[PDB]
Design an enzyme around this catalytic site. Structure first.
Site, mmCIF file in Angstrom:
data_model
loop_
_atom_site.group_PDB
_atom_site.id
_atom_site.type_symbol
_atom_site.label_atom_id
_atom_site.label_comp_id
_atom_site.label_asym_id
_atom_site.label_seq_id
_atom_site.Cartn_x
_atom_site.Cartn_y
_atom_site.Cartn_z
ATOM 1 N N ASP A 1 -3.218 5.305 -0.298
ATOM 2 C CA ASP A 1 -4.164 4.217 -0.078
ATOM 3 C C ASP A 1 -4.509 4.046 1.394
ATOM 4 O O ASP A 1 -5.581 3.523 1.719
ATOM 5 C CB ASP A 1 -3.603 2.911 -0.629
ATOM 6 C CG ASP A 1 -3.526 2.897 -2.136
ATOM 7 O OD1 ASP A 1 -4.352 3.574 -2.770
ATOM 8 O OD2 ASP A 1 -2.638 2.211 -2.685
ATOM 9 N N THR A 2 -3.617 4.463 2.294
ATOM 10 C CA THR A 2 -3.834 4.228 3.718
ATOM 11 C C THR A 2 -5.098 4.927 4.204
ATOM 12 O O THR A 2 -5.909 4.337 4.927
ATOM 13 C CB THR A 2 -2.618 4.695 4.517
ATOM 14 O OG1 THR A 2 -1.459 3.968 4.092
ATOM 15 C CG2 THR A 2 -2.835 4.457 6.001
ATOM 16 N N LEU B 1 0.864 -1.169 0.000
ATOM 17 C CA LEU B 1 0.000 0.000 0.000
ATOM 18 C C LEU B 1 0.904 1.224 0.000
ATOM 19 O O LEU B 1 2.094 1.132 0.313
ATOM 20 C CB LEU B 1 -0.930 0.036 1.224
ATOM 21 C CG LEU B 1 -2.250 -0.753 1.286
ATOM 22 C CD1 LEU B 1 -3.269 -0.315 0.249
ATOM 23 C CD2 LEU B 1 -2.041 -2.253 1.249
ATOM 24 N N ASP B 2 0.344 2.380 -0.352
ATOM 25 C CA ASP B 2 1.161 3.590 -0.364
ATOM 26 C C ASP B 2 0.596 4.665 0.556
ATOM 27 O O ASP B 2 -0.363 4.423 1.297
ATOM 28 C CB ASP B 2 1.313 4.138 -1.785
ATOM 29 C CG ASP B 2 -0.005 4.568 -2.397
ATOM 30 O OD1 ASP B 2 -1.054 4.409 -1.746
ATOM 31 O OD2 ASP B 2 0.011 5.070 -3.540
ATOM 32 N N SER B 3 1.188 5.859 0.503
ATOM 33 C CA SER B 3 0.782 6.952 1.379
ATOM 34 C C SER B 3 -0.656 7.402 1.148
ATOM 35 O O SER B 3 -1.273 7.936 2.075
ATOM 36 C CB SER B 3 1.751 8.128 1.212
ATOM 37 O OG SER B 3 1.729 8.651 -0.108
#
Ligand SMILES: CCCCCCCCCCCCCCCCCC(=O)OC[C@H](COP(=O)([O-])OCC(O)COP(=O)([O-])OC[C@@H](COC(=O)CCCCCCCCCCCCCCCCC)OC(=O)CCCCCCCCCCCCCCCCC)OC(=O)CCCCCCCCCCCCCCCCC
Ligand SMILES: CCCCCCCCCCC(CCCCCCCCCC)(CO[C@H]1O[C@@H](CO)[C@H](O[C@@H]2O[C@@H](CO)[C@H](O)[C@@H](O)[C@@H]2O)[C@@H](O)[C@@H]1O)CO[C@H]1O[C@@H](CO)[C@H](O[C@@H]2O[C@@H](CO)[C@H](O)[C@@H](O)[C@@H]2O)[C@@H](O)[C@H]1O
Ligand SMILES: CCCCCCCCCCCCCCCCCC(=O)OC[C@H](COP(=O)([O-])OCC[N+](C)(C)C)OC(=O)CCCCCCCCCCCCCCCCC
Ligand SMILES: CCCCCCCCCCCCCCCCCC(=O)OC[C@H](COP(=O)(O)OCCN)OC(=O)CCCCCCCCCCCCCCCCC
Ligand SMILES: CCCCCCCCCCCCCCCCCC(=O)OC[C@H](COP(=O)(O)OCCN)OC(=O)CCCCCCCCCCCCCCCCC
Ligand SMILES: CCCCCCCCCCCCCCCCCC(=O)OC[C@H](COP(=O)(O)OCCN)OC(=O)CCCCCCCCCCCCCCCCC
Ligand SMILES: CCCCCCCCCCCCCCCCCC(=O)OC[C@H](COP(=O)(O)OCCN)OC(=O)CCCCCCCCCCCCCCCCC
Ligand SMILES: CCCCCCCCCCCCCCCCCC(=O)OC[C@H](COP(=O)(O)OCCN)OC(=O)CCCCCCCCCCCCCCCCC
Ligand SMILES: CCCCCCCCCCCCCCCCCC(=O)OC[C@H](COP(=O)(O)OCCN)OC(=O)CCCCCCCCCCCCCCCCC
Ligand SMILES: CCCCCCCCCCCCCCCCCC(=O)OC[C@H](COP(=O)(O)OCCN)OC(=O)CCCCCCCCCCCCCCCCC
Ligand SMILES: *P(=O)(O)OCC(C)(C)[C@H](O)C(=O)NCCC(=O)NCCSC(=O)CCCCCCCCCCCCC
Lengths: 60, 98, 17, 80, 68, 85, 74, 670, 73
Positions: free
Chosen positions: F44-45, F40-42
């Site tokens: 998507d969190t 996941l990335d910054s």
């Protein structure tokens, strides 16, 4: 228009079910037999079907 | 700075859209336009326009602010918020002559 | 488990009436 | 669940989740009082209920058995 | 005198000594503290009241138009 | 009677199991960091948080929406608030 | 479930009982006692109000007219 | 017996509220519900005796006020109107009492609650059973205090507190005009017993009829929420739903309607008040129906439906047709009660959520709950041959039957309001029931699918329906909402019915429209609302779950954005109320108590006299230097001035001015 | 003279009470403040008094029937 790309027509154009999406699997259960369009309207009028049968009997 | 607040705009951006469109399968594809819109400004680095970019978007959130956003009942603005409140002080009162 | 007495107030009101 | 609350706070309406072990005989004791003064009201009501049009004997009429303004009239009408 | 602002606009999820009031323990107070708290008349903030008179008038004109 | 450890772990598991953007459903554990463990990335969190509160019927304030970055913290955060249904 | 009813009336704890400050005997037997006795006397106190006296005259006053047929003709 | 149905609801409430400690939760419920049930059974007997046999009964216990011409008694009169009023009050109050047994088994303070609803029941009987206007005002203020006490039942809700203030304060605003009107009745007639006002009304001055009639018109607005005095009602729904059913749907908000009907022998001798009764009724009819459409709370939507049906009630009053008003009145009460009660079981099913944005499905989950709310809505929308059909529809023909400009004008206004009535009627049915789910999983996650390994015992809670105590009132009202309209159509409406022959509802032949309502009206207009009802509903069915795009397109347009927000926010009326009415009061108080009281009043008064008199006397003390030569010069100066005053024959004004001048140069320092 | 319960006395609240108590000592006469004092002490009561005088004895409802006037002057 704006420094950020934001078009009203393009914003409203994407108002539809997307062909690809990372979220059907979490949202698929809603569009199943439990809440399908036919099953939702299966009991829209609960006693309407039964009542007509008795109504025709009264006429005859 | 310029990072914590940036996520906050996206936190409410898709949330604001859902409270306008009750049928959220419409909202489901609505977020992708919102999502891809964020992805376009990926490696923007200079704070001079980056701060101005956050100011501009905050203007349109107010321009599209809902007349009454959704809140869960047990929440500030919810229906059940502060409904059955226990007394803050459970200990009995001390011996005083009143 | 504990029991509530009728209480003097009940008798005063009923007695007064 | 159950909300915690102080145990010292005396209420006339009972408190938080109030119910005594004797909620029945006490209910019966109070229930007699309501009945006792209800008929007490009913007596005074039956004695002061004033009317001007008399009912037909045939018609259904629950008050023909307790009220005074027509019971005397009915027996007065039973004289011919 | 601090800025005269209703506590309606204070953060509900912020750390408050008195959350029910949204006030810090020794927080300075306006001389209108009595009518600037949470139990004060709610301040609606949909639109500027200048526009409100215009929008309601359109409905009134519509009512007059239909009556004619 | 209230929410339990097993009540939240499996129930939340069925949420991110529907992701087509994670590395794989077998990489989620009790202490699965949202970035290092599963993919996941910054951005998507916060999208996950939008899902979590919606299916937990609560709100996640922006102040507490940033310490939340792993499934382990999700278990302890939710059990802290008894407002959960 | 339903909790047993509890509370400390007058703030007197279950271990102890209420202690008098000395006002109670004068307030209940003197102040409230006198008024209750006074209530008894008032039901016997004769009716001396201007309404009552004027009812009787006005009742006679209408009797020399069509309204209020007099019980005893003159 | 007739005085007993006044006492019983009072007796349950004091034992519930003052000895609720000594009867417990279940005892408080059993005592008060039985008292209501007993009062219910005798109420229906009185309806069979007062009305059907035509015997009104009088009770005069003793005097209340006795001052010269003013003899107000604690007296009670039953006639055709008050027995009809007491039917919906007592049937619904009992059902709501039963409905609350299931509703509030989790609320701690459950026996303070059951006393308030039985205290509400007591004061509503007082209101309708009075001989006179002043005793009515006891039940009037009594239900107002009962409503405050129930709106702020969860008094730790600040929202309930402001809502309770609004309900209490707004109703006082009307009660001022009602009280001033009763002052006009006492002034112009010497009393306010109903027999005395109405016998003499056909002879009193026209202008006193308007002034009295107007005052009671404003008082009707506050109780029966109207176009201006309504802000208190939609947020009165902050109370528990049982409260809203009994009080804020069917009984308390028709107190103003009942007053207009009760005073018909009086108000019928001035067309002016009836004219405003008409136009205000339609304006409030359309003003309310529009608002509910844009409401994201089921309780707040059904609250706005109450005002709209209330609005048509006043319209028929202005039509000089009170028999229709009573007929519609009671008929609206039965199904509208169910509509809130049906919503109440809905709220219990979910985790007490009230937003439509997270409602959907629930067809299989709440079959009975859906069935009743459809039954109620059909009578609400005046579906033909229902309880609400005869009552709601007849109005429009009665409105159109009066072949005047105003009657036809409000027919369009009522019809367009009826059109929007359909829109939210299906909106509640669609979003909650006939649509895709919009809440979380727990609302619908049944046990049929396993979906759980070690938590199979718990965590399901899939929004099941309530128990017997919650469903029994639903079924009871369901029968009434189907058949009760047809059974009593001749009882109230009829054509030449002689039910109201004790001058309980007075109608004047000069504006009879009953015969024109059935004959002169064209057939198309008679069935026109039926055409609109069946038609305008399917567009809503077409616009949602079939297209679901046009509504979104209309929302986001600049013209369409504001029209959604403007109507959602209640026409900004409360905005115009809070800022320019109550905040103005709160600042006039601020100006008076800062600038005036702890201000100029003190400065031009005690504090000012204090400060200056202290200085003036320090200065005269300054001359007291205790030196003998200075003192001799002072003596010689006074010796000089007394000679000057005397032999010059000075006018005394100079001496006064010299003294003021000296005192006020002694005031000046240095 | 007796002692009371223990209270979290807030200095901001405590000092706000001091100023409200002592505000009377700092009032001054200004162009604004005399206008406020003049409107609410003089003009407004003079307005009511003028209307009360001008409409005194003017109306009476007591038993005025149809065909008669409320007014008496
Ligand atoms: C009433 C109408 C007006 C008010 C309307 C508003 C409603 C107010 C409701 C009451 C408040 C809440 C009640 C609950 C509560 O808090 O309970 C506290 C508490 C409950 O605890 P408890 O264990 O039952 O009582 C312990 C005692 O306090 C322990 O102390 P105690 O036992 O010493 O208390 C007794 C005390 C009480 O003092 C009084 O007598 C004062 C109260 C007088 C009441 C009116 C007169 C009574 C009838 C007289 C006869 C007819 C005239 O008197 C005495 O000491 C007796 C000595 C003799 C006095 C007379 C001397 C002359 C005799 C010869 C003549 O009750 C009391 O404190 C008793 C007095 C108060 C209640 C009176 C009756 C209330 C009835 C409520 C329902 C009906 C309302 C009206 C109709 C609607
Ligand atoms: C939300 C509104 C609520 C009310 C709704 C409408 C109410 C309407 C009633 C208004 C009312 C009742 C006042 C009672 C007030 C106390 C009662 C309340 C106590 C509780 C006030 O009537 C006043 O009217 C004023 C002016 O007319 C006059 O007052 C003073 O005037 C000056 C003196 O020199 C001073 O300068 C001024 O300072 C004073 O004021 C007086 O004439 C009179 O006292 C009566 O109005 C009536 O007045 C008469 C004569 O005029 C008129 O009749 C007409 O006469 C023929 C032409 O001659 C017409 O051919 C005929 O067709 C019609 O019959 C109409 O006017 C009529 O309306
Ligand atoms: C005649 C003028 C009467 C003016 C009365 C002034 C009374 C001032 C008391 C201040 C009230 C304190 C309070 O917080 O109440 C809030 C209450 C509650 O209003 P609210 O807007 O704050 O409620 C908010 C609701 N939620 C929280 C859900 C968003 O407001 C009032 O009571 C003021 C209205 C009074 C009644 C309106 C009378 C208008 C008459 C119109 C015809 C003329
Ligand atoms: C609890 C209710 C108990 C009271 C019931 C009273 C009652 O049922 O009516 C009595 C009535 C007797 O009258 P009767 O002399 O028989 O005249 C009819 C001759 N065929 O019995 C009858 O046969 C008359 C028919 C019943 C009365 C009408 C019932 C319907 C009234 C409209 C609904 C009223 C709702 C309130
Ligand atoms: C075919 C004929 C041509 C049709 C289209 C012609 C253009 C429109 C007709 C001329 C305009 C009439 C006035 C109506 C109007 O302008 O409403 C606009 C108003 C909001 O004003 P707006 O400037 O659009 O908002 C900008 C905010 N950033 O919107 C509102 O505030 C709504 C208030 C009125 C709502 C009452 C119900 C509708 C009444 C219609 C009139
Ligand atoms: C102890 C605590 C419990 C008791 C509390 C008190 C209870 C009583 C409360 C009193 C309230 C009034 C109700 C009782 C009425 C009794 C009136 C009465 O005592 O009689 C009047 C008495 C004698 O009347 P009379 O002979 O006409 O006096 C002429 C004097 N020139 O008039 C007199 O002259 C009496 C002279 C002596 C008293 C002075
Ligand atoms: C609380 C509920 C009180 C219930 C009423 C108590 C008394 C019931 C009996 C009514 C009665 O007979 O009169 C009551 C009494 C006298 O009233 P009165 O108007 O004088 O009657 C005779 C007319 N000349 O007047 C009274 O007793 C006043 C009622 C008690 C005051 C509280
Ligand atoms: C005309 C017939 C149009 C029918 C459209 C309403 C039915 C469809 C519908 O359900 O709209 C609902 C929507 C608000 O509902 P929402 O919570 O936003 O979610 C959607 C749930 N359906 O409602 C909307 O989004 C707005 C759709 C209706 C807008 C109507 C505006 C035109 C009428 C304004 C008043 C005109 C009359 C003015 C007064 C005349 C008399 C004086
Ligand atoms: C009402 C009075 C309001 C008032 O302000 O009085 C104060 C006045 C002057 O004092 P002040 O100006 O307030 O102090 C200086 C502040 N810079 O102080 C005064 O002028 C005192 C006025 C009282 C009059 C003196 C007593 C006269 C007695 C009759 C004398 C003639 C014979
Ligand atoms: C016709 C009128 C009939 C009589 C009515 C009037 C009688 C009262 C006035 C005369 C009273 C006798 C005392 C005269 C007096 O006090 O005058 C001396 C006065 C002192 O004031 P001053 O000089 O400023 O003090 C500082 C010292 N270097 O020197 C001055 O310049 C006077 C200024 C103040 C005057 C005060 C007078 C006494 C108090 C009143
Ligand atoms: P991770 O993704 O957390 O990393 C975030 C980073 C650090 C890259 C920041 O995003 C960043 O520094 N990026 C550059 C500056 C920035 O903040 N960019 C983000 C996009 S700002 C933008 O494009 C403005 C508009 C955003 C969308 C607003 C939508 C509002 C609602 C619209 C609909 C209203 C009616 C329903």
């Amino acid at each position: 228009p704006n420094i950020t790309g934001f078009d009203m027509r393009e914003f409203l154009r994407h108002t539809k079910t997307p062909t690809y999406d990372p979220w059907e699997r979490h949202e698929a259960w809603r569009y199943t037999g439990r809440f399908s369009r036919f099953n939702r309207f299966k009991g829209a009028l609960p006693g309407f079907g039964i009542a007509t049968v008795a109504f025709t009997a009264y006429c005859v | 700075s310029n990072r914590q607040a940036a996520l906050s705009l996206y936190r409410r951006a898709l949330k604001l859209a859902l409270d306008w469109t009750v049928h959220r399968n419409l909202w489901r594809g609505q977020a992708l336009y919102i999502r891809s819109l964020f992805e376009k400004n990926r490696n923007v680095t200079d704070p001079r326009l980056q701060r101005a970019l956050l100011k501009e978007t905050e203007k349109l959130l107010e321009k599209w602010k809902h007349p009454d956003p959704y809140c869960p009942p047990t929440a500030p603005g919810g229906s059940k918020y502060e409904r059955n409140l226990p007394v803050p002080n459970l200990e009995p009162p001390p011996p005083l002559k009143f | 488990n504990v029991e509530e007495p009728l209480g003097a107030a009940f008798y005063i009101a009923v007695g007064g009436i | 669940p159950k909300i915690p609350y102080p145990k010292h706070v005396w209420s006339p309406a009972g408190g938080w989740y109030a119910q005594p072990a004797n909620w029945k005989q006490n209910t019966a004791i109070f229930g007699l009082v309501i009945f006792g003064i209800t008929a007490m009201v009913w007596k005074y009501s039956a004695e002061h209920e004033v009317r001007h049009k008399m009912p037909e004997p045939d018609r259904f009429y629950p008050s023909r058995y307790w009220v005074k303004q027509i019971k005397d009239y009915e027996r007065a009408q039973k004289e011919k | 005198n601090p800025p005269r602002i209703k506590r309606q606009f204070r953060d509900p999820h912020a750390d408050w000594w008195d959350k029910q009031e949204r006030r810090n323990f020794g927080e300075p107070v306006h001389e209108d503290h009595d009518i600037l708290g949470m139990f004060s008349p709610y301040e609606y903030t949909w639109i500027t009241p200048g526009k409100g008179l215009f929008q309601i008038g359109l409905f009134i004109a519509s009512f007059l138009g239909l009556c004619y | 009677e209230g929410l339990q450890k097993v009540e939240v772990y499996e129930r939340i598991k069925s949420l991110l199991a529907g992701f087509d953007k994670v590395n794989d459903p077998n990489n989620i554990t009790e202490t699965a960091h949202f970035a290092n463990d599963l993919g996941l990335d910054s951005l998507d969190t916060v999208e996950v948080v939008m899902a979590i509160e919606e299916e937990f019927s609560i709100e996640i304030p922006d102040k507490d929406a940033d310490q939340i970055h792993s499934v382990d913290k999700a278990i302890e955060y939710i059990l802290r608030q008894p407002d959960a249904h | 479930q339903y909790d047993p009813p509890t509370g400390w009336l007058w703030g007197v704890r279950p271990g102890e009982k209420y202690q008098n400050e000395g006002w109670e005997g004068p307030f209940f037997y003197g102040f409230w006692g006198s008024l209750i006795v006074f209530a008894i006397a008032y039901a016997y106190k004769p009716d001396t109000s201007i309404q009552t006296w004027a009812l009787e005259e006005a009742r006679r006053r209408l009797e020399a007219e069509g309204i209020l047929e007099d019980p005893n003709p003159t | 017996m007739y005085l007993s149905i006044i006492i019983l609801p009072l007796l349950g409430s004091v034992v519930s509220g003052f000895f609720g400690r000594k009867v417990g939760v279940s005892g408080a419920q059993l005592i008060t519900c039985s008292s209501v049930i007993i009062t219910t059974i005798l109420s229906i007997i009185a309806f069979f005796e007062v009305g059907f046999n035509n015997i009104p009964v009088t009770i005069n216990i003793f005097r209340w006020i006795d001052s010269e011409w003013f003899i107000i008694n604690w007296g009670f009169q039953y006639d055709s109107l008050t027995v009809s009023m007491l039917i919906p009050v007592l049937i619904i109050s009992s059902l709501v009492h039963i409905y609350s047994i299931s509703y509030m088994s989790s609320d701690p303070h459950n026996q303070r609650f059951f006393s308030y609803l039985s205290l509400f029941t007591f004061m509503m009987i007082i209101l309708v059973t009075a001989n006179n206007y002043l005793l009515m005002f006891v039940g009037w203020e009594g239900v107002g205090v009962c409503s405050y006490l129930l709106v702020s039942f969860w008094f730790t809700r600040i929202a309930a507190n402001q809502s309770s203030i609004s309900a209490f304060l707004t109703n006082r605003v009307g009660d001022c005009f009602l009280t001033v009107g009763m002052f006009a009745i006492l002034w112009s007639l010497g009393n306010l017993d109903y027999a005395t006002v109405f016998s003499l009304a056909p002879y009193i001055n026209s202008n006193v009829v308007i002034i009295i009639g107007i005052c009671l018109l404003i008082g009707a607005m506050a109780k029966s929420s109207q176009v201006g005095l309504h802000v208190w009602l939609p947020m009165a729904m902050e109370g528990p739903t049982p409260v809203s059913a009994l009080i804020h749907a069917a009984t308390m908000v028709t107190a103003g309607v009942y007053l207009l009907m009760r005073s018909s022998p009086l108000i019928e001798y001035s067309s002016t008040v009836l004219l405003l009764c008409l136009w205000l009724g339609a304006i409030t009819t359309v003003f309310s129906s529009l608002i509910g459409l844009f409401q994201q709370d089921i309780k707040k939507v059904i609250a706005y439906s109450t005002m709209s049906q209330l609005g048509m009630m006043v319209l028929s009053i202005g039509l000089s047709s009170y028999n229709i008003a009573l007929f519609h009145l009671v008929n609206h009460a039965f199904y509208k009660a169910l509509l809130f009660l049906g919503a109440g079981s809905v709220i219990h099913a979910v985790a007490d959520n009230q937003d439509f944005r997270k409602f959907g499905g629930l067809i299989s989950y709440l079959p009975l709950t859906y069935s009743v709310m459809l039954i109620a809505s059909l009578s609400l929308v005046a579906f033909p041959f229902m309880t609400g059909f005869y009552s709601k529809d007849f109005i429009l023909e009665s409105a159109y039957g009066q072949f005047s400009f105003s009657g036809v004008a409000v027919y369009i206004i009522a019809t367009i309001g009826a059109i929007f009535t359909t829109l939210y009627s299906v909106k509640v049915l669609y979003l909650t029931f006939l649509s895709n789910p919009n809440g979380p999983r727990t609302y619908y996650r049944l046990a049929i699918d396993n979906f759980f390994s070690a938590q199979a015992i718990k965590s399901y809670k899939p929004a099941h329906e309530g128990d017997f105590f919650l469903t029994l009132p639903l079924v009871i009202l369901a029968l009434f909402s189907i058949f009760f309209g047809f059974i009593t159509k001749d009882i109230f409406i009829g054509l030449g019915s002689n039910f109201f022959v004790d001058n309980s509802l007075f109608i004047h032949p000069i504006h009879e429209i009953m015969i024109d309502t059935e004959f002169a009206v064209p057939v198309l207009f008679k069935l026109l609302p039926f055409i609109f009802t069946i038609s305008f509903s399917v567009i809503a069915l077409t616009l949602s779950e079939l297209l679901s795009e046009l509504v979104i397109y209309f929302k986001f347009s600049r013209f369409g954005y504001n029209i959604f927000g403007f109507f959602n926010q209640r026409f900004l009326i409360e905005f115009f109320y809070n800022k320019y009415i109550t905040n103005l009061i709160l600042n006039l108080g601020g100006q008076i108590t800062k600038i005036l009281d702890k201000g100029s009043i003190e400065l031009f008064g005690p504090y000012g006299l204090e400060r200056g008199l202290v200085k003036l006397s320090k200065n005269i003390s300054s001359l007291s230097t205790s030196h003998v030569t200075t003192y001799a010069l002072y003596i010689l100066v006074g010796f000089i001035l007394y000679l000057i005053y005397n032999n010059l024959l000075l006018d005394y004004s100079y001496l006064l001015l010299i003294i003021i001048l000296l005192l006020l140069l002694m005031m000046i320092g240095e | 003279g007796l002692q009371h319960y223990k209270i979290a006395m807030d200095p901001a609240l405590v000092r706000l009470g001091s100023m409200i108590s002592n505000r009377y000592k700092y009032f001054r006469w200004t162009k604004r403040t005399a206008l406020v004092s003049f409107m609410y002490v003089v003009v407004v009561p003079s307005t009511i008094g003028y209307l009360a005088y001008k409409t005194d004895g003017l109306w009476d409802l007591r038993a005025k029937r149809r065909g008669d006037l409320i007014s008496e002057r």
